[PDB]
Tab-separated table of C-alpha atoms and ligand atoms in Angstrom:
chain	number	residue	atom	x	y	z
A	1	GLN	CA	206.990	92.189	181.334
A	2	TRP	CA	203.628	90.556	180.560
A	3	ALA	CA	203.065	86.851	179.950
A	4	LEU	CA	199.888	84.790	179.582
A	5	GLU	CA	200.444	83.457	183.096
A	6	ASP	CA	199.703	86.923	184.552
A	7	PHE	CA	196.031	86.596	183.579
A	8	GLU	CA	192.907	84.662	184.447
A	9	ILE	CA	190.861	83.946	181.293
A	10	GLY	CA	187.065	83.965	181.018
A	11	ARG	CA	184.629	83.565	178.113
A	12	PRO	CA	185.328	84.743	174.554
A	13	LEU	CA	183.572	88.054	173.962
A	14	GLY	CA	183.895	87.639	170.198
A	15	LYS	CA	185.858	86.069	167.352
A	16	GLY	CA	187.382	87.318	164.116
A	17	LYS	CA	189.455	86.185	161.147
A	18	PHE	CA	192.640	86.786	163.090
A	19	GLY	CA	191.647	85.608	166.567
A	20	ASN	CA	189.429	86.078	169.604
A	21	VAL	CA	188.824	88.593	172.367
A	22	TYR	CA	188.475	87.167	175.895
A	23	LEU	CA	187.288	88.607	179.136
A	24	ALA	CA	190.413	88.476	181.283
A	25	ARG	CA	191.648	89.468	184.742
A	26	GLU	CA	195.172	90.477	185.711
A	27	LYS	CA	195.985	88.158	188.608
A	28	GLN	CA	197.523	90.632	191.066
A	29	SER	CA	195.178	93.619	190.786
A	30	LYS	CA	192.041	91.607	189.855
A	31	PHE	CA	191.533	94.314	187.189
A	32	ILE	CA	189.238	93.145	184.367
A	33	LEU	CA	190.435	93.775	180.809
A	34	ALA	CA	189.926	92.445	177.272
A	35	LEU	CA	192.696	90.144	176.067
A	36	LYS	CA	192.778	90.138	172.269
A	37	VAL	CA	194.642	87.091	170.940
A	38	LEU	CA	195.726	87.044	167.304
A	39	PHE	CA	197.213	83.935	165.718
A	40	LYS	CA	200.537	84.449	163.975
A	41	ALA	CA	199.582	81.874	161.330
A	42	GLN	CA	196.521	83.932	160.342
A	43	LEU	CA	198.463	87.199	160.381
A	44	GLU	CA	201.188	85.697	158.163
A	45	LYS	CA	198.691	84.052	155.804
A	46	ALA	CA	197.074	87.458	155.207
A	47	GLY	CA	200.362	89.376	155.066
A	48	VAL	CA	199.350	91.848	157.787
A	49	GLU	CA	202.131	91.065	160.282
A	50	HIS	CA	203.844	94.340	159.352
A	51	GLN	CA	200.581	96.303	159.609
A	52	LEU	CA	199.994	95.114	163.180
A	53	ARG	CA	203.510	96.163	164.298
A	54	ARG	CA	202.886	99.630	162.853
A	55	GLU	CA	199.419	99.915	164.375
A	56	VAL	CA	200.545	98.693	167.813
A	57	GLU	CA	203.095	101.526	167.976
A	58	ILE	CA	200.415	104.043	166.909
A	59	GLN	CA	197.779	102.731	169.329
A	60	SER	CA	200.351	102.857	172.133
A	61	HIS	CA	200.523	106.651	171.863
A	62	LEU	CA	196.797	107.279	171.396
A	63	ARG	CA	195.259	108.483	174.666
A	64	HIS	CA	191.721	109.850	174.480
A	65	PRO	CA	188.588	109.241	176.593
A	66	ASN	CA	186.764	108.093	173.418
A	67	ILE	CA	189.442	105.722	172.062
A	68	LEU	CA	189.893	102.258	173.565
A	69	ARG	CA	193.272	102.154	175.246
A	70	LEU	CA	195.954	99.578	174.555
A	71	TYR	CA	197.605	98.834	177.900
A	72	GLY	CA	200.387	96.596	176.627
A	73	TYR	CA	201.171	93.601	174.487
A	74	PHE	CA	203.289	90.460	174.277
A	75	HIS	CA	203.713	87.334	172.180
A	76	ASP	CA	204.627	83.679	172.286
A	77	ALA	CA	205.531	81.251	169.509
A	78	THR	CA	202.055	81.190	167.947
A	79	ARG	CA	200.096	84.207	169.224
A	80	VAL	CA	200.180	87.974	169.678
A	81	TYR	CA	198.379	89.217	172.817
A	82	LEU	CA	196.917	92.723	173.003
A	83	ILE	CA	195.958	93.879	176.512
A	84	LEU	CA	192.989	96.182	175.889
A	85	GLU	CA	190.678	98.320	177.982
A	86	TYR	CA	187.454	96.422	178.671
A	87	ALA	CA	184.337	98.381	177.746
A	88	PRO	CA	181.628	96.845	179.978
A	89	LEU	CA	178.465	97.833	178.071
A	90	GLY	CA	179.242	96.093	174.752
A	91	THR	CA	178.999	97.486	171.231
A	92	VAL	CA	176.879	100.359	169.984
A	93	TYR	CA	175.706	97.884	167.313
A	94	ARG	CA	174.138	95.666	169.978
A	95	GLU	CA	172.514	98.674	171.640
A	96	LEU	CA	171.032	99.525	168.213
A	97	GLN	CA	169.759	95.924	167.924
A	98	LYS	CA	167.993	96.435	171.266
A	99	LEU	CA	166.581	99.936	170.735
A	100	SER	CA	165.961	99.542	166.936
A	101	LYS	CA	166.978	103.191	166.454
A	102	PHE	CA	168.316	106.096	168.481
A	103	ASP	CA	166.626	109.385	169.254
A	104	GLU	CA	168.206	112.674	168.165
A	105	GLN	CA	169.732	113.471	171.564
A	106	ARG	CA	171.516	110.114	171.809
A	107	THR	CA	172.651	110.288	168.175
A	108	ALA	CA	173.942	113.877	168.427
A	109	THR	CA	175.782	113.103	171.662
A	110	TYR	CA	177.502	110.070	170.106
A	111	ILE	CA	178.432	111.958	166.946
A	112	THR	CA	179.943	114.681	169.168
A	113	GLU	CA	182.141	112.161	171.030
A	114	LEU	CA	183.286	110.518	167.798
A	115	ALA	CA	184.042	113.822	166.064
A	116	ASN	CA	186.197	114.815	169.046
A	117	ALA	CA	187.959	111.441	168.947
A	118	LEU	CA	188.571	111.714	165.198
A	119	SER	CA	189.871	115.269	165.525
A	120	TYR	CA	192.429	113.956	168.019
A	121	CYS	CA	193.337	111.113	165.630
A	122	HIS	CA	193.818	113.484	162.689
A	123	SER	CA	196.064	115.699	164.836
A	124	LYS	CA	198.285	112.600	165.134
A	125	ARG	CA	198.091	111.938	161.376
A	126	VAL	CA	195.919	108.881	162.192
A	127	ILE	CA	193.095	108.516	159.657
A	128	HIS	CA	190.445	106.030	158.508
A	129	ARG	CA	189.250	104.433	161.704
A	130	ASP	CA	186.606	101.803	160.857
A	131	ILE	CA	183.857	103.303	163.006
A	132	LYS	CA	181.072	100.954	161.979
A	133	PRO	CA	178.914	100.429	165.121
A	134	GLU	CA	180.387	96.977	165.812
A	135	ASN	CA	183.750	98.732	166.374
A	136	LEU	CA	182.283	101.321	168.759
A	137	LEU	CA	182.037	100.316	172.411
A	138	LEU	CA	180.313	101.699	175.487
A	139	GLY	CA	182.333	102.403	178.624
A	140	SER	CA	180.893	102.027	182.111
A	141	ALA	CA	179.618	105.646	182.009
A	142	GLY	CA	178.125	105.036	178.557
A	143	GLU	CA	180.845	106.947	176.726
A	144	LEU	CA	181.697	105.822	173.208
A	145	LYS	CA	185.079	104.191	172.561
A	146	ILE	CA	186.561	103.803	169.090
A	147	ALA	CA	187.836	100.208	169.144
A	148	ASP	CA	188.709	99.140	165.604
A	149	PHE	CA	192.330	98.344	166.563
A	150	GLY	CA	193.411	94.778	165.889
A	151	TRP	CA	190.672	94.248	163.231
A	152	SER	CA	186.973	93.376	163.504
A	153	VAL	CA	185.533	90.753	165.815
A	154	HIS	CA	181.936	89.545	166.046
A	155	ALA	CA	180.000	88.904	169.215
A	156	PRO	CA	177.698	85.853	169.143
A	157	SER	CA	174.662	88.172	169.196
A	158	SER	CA	175.804	89.746	165.903
A	159	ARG	CA	173.920	89.257	162.621
A	160	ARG	CA	176.349	91.197	160.378
A	161	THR	CA	179.627	89.691	159.249
A	162	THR	CA	183.050	91.374	159.575
A	163	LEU	CA	183.171	91.985	155.888
A	164	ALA	CA	179.639	93.248	155.356
A	165	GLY	CA	179.707	95.841	158.124
A	166	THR	CA	183.053	97.209	156.970
A	167	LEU	CA	181.783	97.431	153.405
A	168	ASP	CA	178.687	99.346	154.520
A	169	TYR	CA	180.965	102.173	155.736
A	170	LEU	CA	183.487	102.456	152.875
A	171	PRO	CA	183.559	105.847	151.115
A	172	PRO	CA	183.088	106.167	147.341
A	173	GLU	CA	186.737	107.112	146.803
A	174	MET	CA	187.942	103.831	148.284
A	175	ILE	CA	185.230	101.847	146.495
A	176	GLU	CA	186.345	103.508	143.247
A	177	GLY	CA	190.068	102.964	143.944
A	178	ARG	CA	191.054	106.660	144.001
A	179	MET	CA	193.332	108.585	146.349
A	180	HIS	CA	191.756	109.318	149.693
A	181	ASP	CA	192.514	111.577	152.652
A	182	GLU	CA	191.127	112.233	156.145
A	183	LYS	CA	187.755	113.105	154.612
A	184	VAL	CA	187.052	109.334	154.642
A	185	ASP	CA	186.298	109.768	158.344
A	186	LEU	CA	183.733	112.483	157.637
A	187	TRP	CA	181.963	110.106	155.252
A	188	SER	CA	181.892	107.362	157.911
A	189	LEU	CA	180.353	109.847	160.357
A	190	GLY	CA	177.524	110.448	157.899
A	191	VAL	CA	176.850	106.741	157.449
A	192	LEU	CA	176.858	106.297	161.227
A	193	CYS	CA	174.536	109.244	161.922
A	194	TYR	CA	172.076	107.763	159.412
A	195	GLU	CA	172.276	104.213	160.794
A	196	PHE	CA	171.816	105.628	164.338
A	197	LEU	CA	168.641	107.529	163.427
A	198	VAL	CA	167.208	104.995	160.983
A	199	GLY	CA	168.361	101.626	162.334
A	200	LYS	CA	169.886	100.500	159.006
A	201	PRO	CA	172.906	101.747	157.047
A	202	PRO	CA	172.014	103.985	154.096
A	203	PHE	CA	173.539	101.968	151.208
A	204	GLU	CA	172.431	98.512	152.361
A	205	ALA	CA	171.654	96.203	149.430
A	206	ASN	CA	171.112	92.499	148.821
A	207	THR	CA	174.513	91.906	147.201
A	208	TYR	CA	177.963	93.379	147.753
A	209	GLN	CA	178.096	94.450	144.102
A	210	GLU	CA	174.853	96.410	144.479
A	211	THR	CA	176.177	98.006	147.669
A	212	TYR	CA	179.266	99.148	145.721
A	213	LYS	CA	177.069	100.860	143.152
A	214	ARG	CA	174.854	102.474	145.808
A	215	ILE	CA	177.891	103.885	147.625
A	216	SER	CA	179.599	105.065	144.454
A	217	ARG	CA	176.428	106.801	143.203
A	218	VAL	CA	175.508	107.996	146.744
A	219	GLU	CA	172.042	106.459	146.396
A	220	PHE	CA	170.329	106.942	149.746
A	221	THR	CA	166.908	108.255	150.788
A	222	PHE	CA	165.479	109.336	154.178
A	223	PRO	CA	162.462	107.874	156.005
A	224	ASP	CA	159.752	110.420	156.767
A	225	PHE	CA	160.729	110.802	160.456
A	226	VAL	CA	164.281	112.070	159.851
A	227	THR	CA	164.170	115.759	160.758
A	228	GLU	CA	165.333	118.476	158.421
A	229	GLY	CA	168.343	119.292	160.605
A	230	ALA	CA	169.464	115.645	160.591
A	231	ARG	CA	168.943	115.476	156.826
A	232	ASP	CA	171.140	118.557	156.413
A	233	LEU	CA	174.077	117.169	158.421
A	234	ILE	CA	173.882	113.715	156.842
A	235	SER	CA	173.636	115.190	153.334
A	236	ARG	CA	176.718	117.364	153.892
A	237	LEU	CA	178.754	114.420	155.188
A	238	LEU	CA	177.693	111.985	152.449
A	239	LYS	CA	178.945	114.108	149.549
A	240	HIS	CA	180.648	112.162	146.778
A	241	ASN	CA	183.313	114.893	146.502
A	242	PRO	CA	185.449	114.667	149.679
A	243	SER	CA	186.322	118.381	149.449
A	244	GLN	CA	182.627	119.189	149.856
A	245	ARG	CA	182.407	117.406	153.194
A	246	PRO	CA	182.596	119.592	156.319
A	247	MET	CA	185.493	119.961	158.687
A	248	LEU	CA	185.115	118.062	161.970
A	249	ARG	CA	184.872	121.407	163.807
A	250	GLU	CA	181.998	122.271	161.474
A	251	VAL	CA	180.218	119.047	162.455
A	252	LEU	CA	180.677	119.910	166.121
A	253	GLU	CA	179.113	123.354	165.534
A	254	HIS	CA	176.291	122.205	163.245
A	255	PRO	CA	172.954	123.602	164.535
A	256	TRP	CA	171.355	120.154	164.744
A	257	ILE	CA	174.291	118.854	166.797
A	258	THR	CA	174.331	121.811	169.180
A	259	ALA	CA	170.544	121.738	169.620
A	260	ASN	CA	170.432	118.031	170.534
A	261	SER	CA	173.750	116.892	171.954
A	262	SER	CA	174.539	116.319	175.609
B	301	OGR	C1	176.120	90.654	175.820
B	301	OGR	N1	177.415	91.332	176.170
B	301	OGR	C2	178.342	91.792	175.225
B	301	OGR	O1	178.025	91.604	174.031
B	301	OGR	C3	179.672	92.491	175.465
B	301	OGR	C4	180.634	92.488	174.481
B	301	OGR	C5	181.903	93.108	174.590
B	301	OGR	C6	182.245	93.814	175.780
B	301	OGR	N2	183.507	94.467	175.958
B	301	OGR	C7	184.522	94.660	175.033
B	301	OGR	N3	185.617	95.382	175.484
B	301	OGR	C8	186.654	95.599	174.668
B	301	OGR	C9	186.690	95.167	173.327
B	301	OGR	C10	187.573	95.214	172.191
B	301	OGR	C11	186.980	94.535	171.121
B	301	OGR	C12	187.504	94.392	169.757
B	301	OGR	O2	188.532	93.768	169.478
B	301	OGR	N4	186.805	95.065	168.666
B	301	OGR	C13	187.270	95.000	167.265
B	301	OGR	C14	185.599	95.886	168.948
B	301	OGR	N5	185.724	94.090	171.612
B	301	OGR	C15	184.700	93.261	170.796
B	301	OGR	C16	184.568	91.822	171.313
B	301	OGR	C17	183.148	91.384	170.856
B	301	OGR	C18	182.312	92.685	170.724
B	301	OGR	C19	183.313	93.890	170.807
B	301	OGR	C20	185.500	94.429	172.920
B	301	OGR	N6	184.475	94.187	173.732
B	301	OGR	N7	181.300	93.817	176.761
B	301	OGR	C21	180.077	93.199	176.635
C-alpha cells in the first residue's frame, strides 16, 4: 500500500528526538493528515525500535473519538512513516498559553473526555498514556484527542522541552522506581486538572532534581481561586498511594465534574 509518493508535504508542525510531524495531503482524496516521520537511526540509537512495532500494533486497534487515530504506516530504508489523523486546532498546551488558564466548565469537560478515553484504553489493557497538555490535541469540533503515540514532539511556539513536560506528569511510583499499575493515569489526570485551572503544573521546580522531590513528597499547594470542589477532586487524584486514587468512573461522577462539565 502506502508510499511517500502518495502524499503532498507541507510545513513541519513540530519536531522531536525521533523525527518530525508534517502537514500532509493524500494526493488522490486531497485529505489533509499529519505525517509523522521517525528516523530509523534515532530509533536504533535509543533502542526503541521494538517498542514502536509493539505500539503501532496497539494504536492500530484503538478507535475512540478522543484518541488520535493511526490510519496506516510504511517505511523506507531510513524512515518509518506514521499516517495520523490531523487535529486542526493544535495542542491543549498552546490553548493554555493563549488563555493563561481554563475556567471550571472547560476544565471539567476536558477531564470528562480524557477519563472516557482512558477508561477505553484500560479496557484494552493499554495504560500510561503521557497526557501532558502538549500530547493532547483539539479536533475541528474542539474535542480532545490523546496523541502521545510515536513520542513527544514540540511545536515552534512551545517553551517546554520534551523531557521537562513528561517529567512534570510522572507519578511518585515511577519517580521512586516501584511497581506501577493503571493508577498512573489517575495521577496524570490530577496533574492535568491542576495545570488546566492554575496555568502551571503543580510540582514545577527550578531543577529536575527538585521536581523529583516535589512529586515524591506530593508537595503542591492551591492558589486562592481554586474552588473547594476542584481541590477535592485534585487532592483525591494526587494521592501518593495509588490504591487511594479514585476509579475513572468515580472521577466521571464526582460532584464537581457533574456540576461543571459539558
Ligand atoms: C499554530 N498552529 C499549531 O500549533 C498546530 C499544531 C499541530 C496541529 N495538528 C496536529 N495534528 C496531529 C498531531 C500529532 C502530533 C504528535 O506527534 N504528538 C506527539 C502530539 N502532533 C504535534 C505536532 C506539533 C504539535 C502537536 C500533531 N499536531 N495543528 C495546529
